[PDB]
Symmetry: C2
């Protein structure tokens, strides 16, 4: 779009390269030299634009997340006071368009958060996921809306699993059980899991 | 156990090193030199004992799996004709003792199976998981044991998720929603998901 300067292109090349050496490839100490070689830029531009490799990665996480979170927020404006079903339906609708986002988030979440090399990326991660309704079944239990013997932690965990796991499972394994995660299948799956959750946990 | 020769110890050091550069660390082309340096052996012993790096990795996968599959088979001898609940209860019982096994399997399953470097490890993977009851809800649908509007693919996917996802989610995230996967919690969770599946999908 438009006629970007070499300078802004270079900046965006670095952020793209960071995103790819995360979605597609290497682990911890990918060097500055390697990111810059993938981007096709002077390695000095990482420190110039971002100060550090860690800030390049956190900046990539925010930029990657911004439109995803905007879409989910827009999708959820329409929906009802905490309804597990609505959260799951809108999650599927948005992650249908951003199929790699859940696996990226889960990968970041698995970093060793005790290591100082990971503090900046971890701070970014928790900011990005701060929208999550991590006690929704606790609230439902307290409003007496769950079956009497339902445990909120267990309900929450199984909800989290049905929502997120489809996007984390390798395509190799979905194919093996006859599934492709098309928009149509995710629409069926939203409908099916809505009913599993209602009949399973609510009354 | 016993007094192993340096020769068998060295062999087992290589298999251990392979297992760790898989559970803990690097991606694709970890070299022979690097595996042997981690093991503390001559790099020539990889080709000597195993022929190739790929056969070292497949051999590690089988050896890692053998006692896990034996335990699950033993646990399931006691159980009833296809019962999703029994599969999930025994899975939790065995993966409680082998908490890293599901994440290892899922990691292997995500390799690019079109690449020739991955054919051997992929063959091993599919052998290890050949026990999985990947059409159990299809069979249940056909025996008329599911609710009328239940889709077998969707049921199977949500079952797979509740069974496996707990072991794949980073501990950072379980802790954030107040969960540690203790034997006691997995026992509660088995009980809870048994009821979610019955009330959710069966009649």
């Amino acid at each position: 779009v438009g006629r970007p300067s070499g300078d802004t292109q270079n900046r965006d090349k670095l952020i793209l390269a960071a995103r790819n050496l995360f979605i597609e490839r290497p682990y911890a100490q990918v060097s500055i030299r390697e990111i810059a070689s993938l981007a096709g830029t002077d390695p000095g531009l990482i420190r110039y634009y971002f100060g550090s490799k860690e800030k390049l990665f956190s900046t990539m996480i925010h930029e990657t997340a911004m439109p995803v979170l905007a879409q989910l927020h827009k999708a959820r404006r329409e929906t009802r006071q905490e309804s597990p079903a609505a959260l799951l339906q809108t999650y599927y609708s948005v992650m249908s368009k951003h199929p790699h986002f859940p696996r990226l988030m889960l990968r970041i979440a698995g970093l060793d958060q005790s290591l100082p090399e990971n503090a900046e990326v971890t701070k970014a991660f928790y900011e990005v996921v701060n929208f999550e309704n991590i006690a929704i079944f606790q609230r439902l239990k307290d409003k007496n809306l769950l079956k009497d013997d339902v445990d909120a932690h267990c309900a929450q965990l199984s909800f989290f699993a049905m929502m997120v796991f489809p996007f984390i499972v390798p395509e190799n394994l979905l194919e093996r059980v006859g599934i492709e995660l098309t928009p149509d299948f995710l629409q069926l799956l939203a409908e099916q899991n809505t009913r599993l959750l209602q009949r399973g946990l609510m009354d």
